[PDB]
Subunit: 334 residues, 3 copies
Amino acid sequence: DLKLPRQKVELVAPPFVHAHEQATKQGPKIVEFKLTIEEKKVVIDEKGTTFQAMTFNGSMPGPLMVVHEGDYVETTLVNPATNTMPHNIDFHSATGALGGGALTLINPGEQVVLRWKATKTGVFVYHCAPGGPMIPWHVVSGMNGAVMVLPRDGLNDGKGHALKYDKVYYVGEQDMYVPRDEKGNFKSYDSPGEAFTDTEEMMKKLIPSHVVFNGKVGALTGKNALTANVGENVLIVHSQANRDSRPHLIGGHGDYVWETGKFGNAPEVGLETWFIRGGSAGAAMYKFMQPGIYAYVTHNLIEAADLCATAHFKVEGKWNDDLMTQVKAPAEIP
Amino acid sequence: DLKLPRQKVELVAPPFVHAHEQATKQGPKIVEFKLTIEEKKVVIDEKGTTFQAMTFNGSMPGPLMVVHEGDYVETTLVNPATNTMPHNIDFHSATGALGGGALTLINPGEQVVLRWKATKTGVFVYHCAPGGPMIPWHVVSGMNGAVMVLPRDGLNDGKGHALKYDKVYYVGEQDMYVPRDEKGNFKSYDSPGEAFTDTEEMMKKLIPSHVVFNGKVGALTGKNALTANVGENVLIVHSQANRDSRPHLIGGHGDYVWETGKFGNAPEVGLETWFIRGGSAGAAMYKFMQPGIYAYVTHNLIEAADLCATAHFKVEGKWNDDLMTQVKAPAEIP
Amino acid sequence: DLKLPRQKVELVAPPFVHAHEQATKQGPKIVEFKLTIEEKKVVIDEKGTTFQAMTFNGSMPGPLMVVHEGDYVETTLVNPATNTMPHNIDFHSATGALGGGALTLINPGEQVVLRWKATKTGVFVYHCAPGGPMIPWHVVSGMNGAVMVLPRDGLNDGKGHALKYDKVYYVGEQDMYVPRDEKGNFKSYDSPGEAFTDTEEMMKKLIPSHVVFNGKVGALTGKNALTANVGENVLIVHSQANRDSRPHLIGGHGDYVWETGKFGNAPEVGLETWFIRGGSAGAAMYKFMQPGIYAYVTHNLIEAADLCATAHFKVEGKWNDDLMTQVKAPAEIP
Ligand SMILES: OC[C@H]1O[C@@](CO)(O[C@H]2O[C@H](CO)[C@@H](O)[C@H](O)[C@H]2O)[C@@H](O)[C@@H]1O
Ligand SMILES: OC[C@H]1O[C@@](CO)(O[C@H]2O[C@H](CO)[C@@H](O)[C@H](O)[C@H]2O)[C@@H](O)[C@@H]1O
Ligand SMILES: OC[C@H]1O[C@@](CO)(O[C@H]2O[C@H](CO)[C@@H](O)[C@H](O)[C@H]2O)[C@@H](O)[C@@H]1O
Ligand SMILES: O=N[O-]
Ligand SMILES: O=N[O-]
Ligand SMILES: O=N[O-]
Ligand SMILES: [Cu+2]
Ligand SMILES: [Cu+2]
Ligand SMILES: [Cu+2]
Ligand SMILES: [Cu+2]
Ligand SMILES: [Cu+2]
Ligand SMILES: [Cu+2]
């Protein structure tokens, strides 16, 4: 019935983002994505704590899907028979049927195909929402990601100037609720079903045990640090499907920030810390001016340093002494 | 002394709103409202948990009061002798005397009349504030509502285009603190005074037991779902007098949103989730494009699904397959 | 190497702010500040609870530093030998080296001199950040303040009109984590090092025991109330280095508010309550219209009334009956 060209997208694991154009001369197309649900026990910290995760495509967050305004997004959702629970998908970018959730419920062994038109620009959460108390449980178990709907002319600053990024990263923040036993050690479970009772009791007290980026403490540090060069404009897309976050780039700024994540609104300029409302994604762009290590954190510093919510950037380039200099190194007080 | 025409308003229970004009050719008037305090034990969940509520006009939230910029709002506050405590009222829309709280303290058996000029447009909280530790207790017991001060020319989009709503609903979100006994069951009390000690201990730990719309789990579901039709522009006013909230219309958007609630500022466009700061009201308008059920939630999904914060909309009209379609129904994986 | 005029600033204790110009015809200069770290046991409430504080210049918050865009800020940080721990400083206003933290780590007995160029306007947090789990601990122990970077032409409303304040106050909000013993009394400790284990356990549960302005319950009340006169435009700078806050002036408004704190963005108008994201500072200006007492609170009313987060303003001038009047004093119900 709908006769537009079709384009397949090969999704990639976060924090990377599949190849895409910013400004395009393509007209609308049907863009085809596939997500396969995987339920799996994973390690979430350096002490070896385990967690019953539920994921789109094996990752937390699920992959970033990128399209342009007026595209039709056609998603094949697959729930293999090796899973134990029904799942679905709700796109905050979509209109009707609970974001698609009412049309995508699939038992283990089934798949479904949903199409929605991308009428609203910005970055948006997607997540599983199977019904009732299951909705929060599936989301905080890892079943969330994001989709970016770009204007066809790319991003702008709201004063008529183009904003082009040199690279984009997707940082998905996940609040996790891992119960402790009487001795005070984290509990491990054999199945998501068995984790449910204890996990729900903890969830309703609203305090996470862990808050992590990309699924694990230290995921985006060391070999897996984010990278840039002095002079590069980097877009950081940040989502949180359940709980607020307050991103901050230590040693940098948000030069242009859409904290509510929606490109019909002009970005704010020159922020120190921005706010991602639980159930939303936002985006910040920064042109790096200095080399060295930066940390990207939520600026609840207890969550950042003690609960897991810290990423690093390693930046190459030349140090600018005009911007900052150590006038006198540490020395004994006169 | 002040010689303007007087107009009486018959308040209605939320989520409905008394009849009013958007744009008006009336000039300023003295608009007269009456609020009668009622203290009462109420049921707040489907399990039969009870709660010592304190309310304006018998409802949680108190009713929405609607006026226009430059009107004088004259409120008669009544504290009948059947109540046990002093009460007052603080309007965030008003200027001076702690929002009127310093001029409205009334013991059981008394009434008072306050007038304030509506110099600031937007939606604003009102709440009881009797002094000291009583202030939070009365507010989280249900003594809060909102008032909407419209521009005389009605709402606009900040680019010169009128925004007219077809209907308005008021959703008041209430964080409730109900203590549990040693067995882990919710406690019941014979009076608000007796609930005070246990309730205050719990309040200071900052985690609610319930978060509800319109006073009870499921208040705005079933027979009492909100309603609309495809093509209707609906304004949703949302208040939270004590704690943040992150409203989201599942399957829709906020087409025009004043998250800080104040109409001197242009609305933001095309939001997925917005943020209501504790101690404020905000407003979002959406033109429905699809029929069916929508849920309106705070997008802390634990609060929404497990603690009570979910409303429904039932929308009539024709399904738009261009916006969304199930391409292939659930079927066995090839 | 850098040959600009030098200007020394004598810092003053909050909530006051050192003398400065708004709009200036001075060009860039090197502005020189000195901060001396002090670790000390302090009383934080009227019951006599003690707390192991760590401070810049002996105060919580540290003093407000005021400069203009394009100034170079040269800070001497001193860690006297009477202290027990290493410390450093991170300015959110600065670019590179973790905001200066990577260049300013000093042991007891040492000092360091850092210079950074003020390229971004607004109000910004500064705080200690010595590494790892120490980062949150030093911040919630009191090691944070703010710096205001003004445009050279002073503030404006984003529609071409100047906004000039008659006075400025700095309100620093501090979340404190004081553990309790088995009887339920607050614990006291002999050193910050000894407070660390118990304090960290409590911090990771994310619920503060106290939330205070200017370091103590009631700090900004009584003799130490903030003051103004009817007709005065007052700027209130508010910071929170770790946790969100929702400032509200009871009986007033935010006439012009930069909630994200950055003067490259136009202020919002006519707010009731605004939001300071943890890890940021914001600023609100209000022209007082009515005399009397006002309270300035975070509008989580439990935090304000029960945990310590309330300041007062005493305002002199003539009462305006047009804005508000008690039409009928409290009287028996007919
Ligand atoms: O950045 C969005 C912001 O910019 C304005 C112009 O100030 O509109 C720009 O962006 C629109 C959406 O991308 C474009 O269609 C428009 O052509 C462009 O000027 C604002 O209207 C908008 O809020
Ligand atoms: O939506 C408010 C926003 O729109 C602007 C114009 O961009 O002003 C409009 O609204 C004012 C308040 O309602 C009107 O008085 C004005 O006439 C109208 O243009 C902005 O100034 C304002 O922030
Ligand atoms: O208040 C900042 C806001 O105002 C605008 C004009 O609408 O720019 C003003 O402020 C700039 C920064 O101070 C000035 O450089 C400019 O000259 C002045 O018009 C907006 O661009 C800005 O976002
Ligand atoms: O050991 N179980 O709580
Ligand atoms: O049974 N009372 O806690
Ligand atoms: O008495 N100590 O927990
Ligand atoms: Cu699922
Ligand atoms: Cu959702
Ligand atoms: Cu009351
Ligand atoms: Cu209030
Ligand atoms: Cu320190
Ligand atoms: Cu910081």
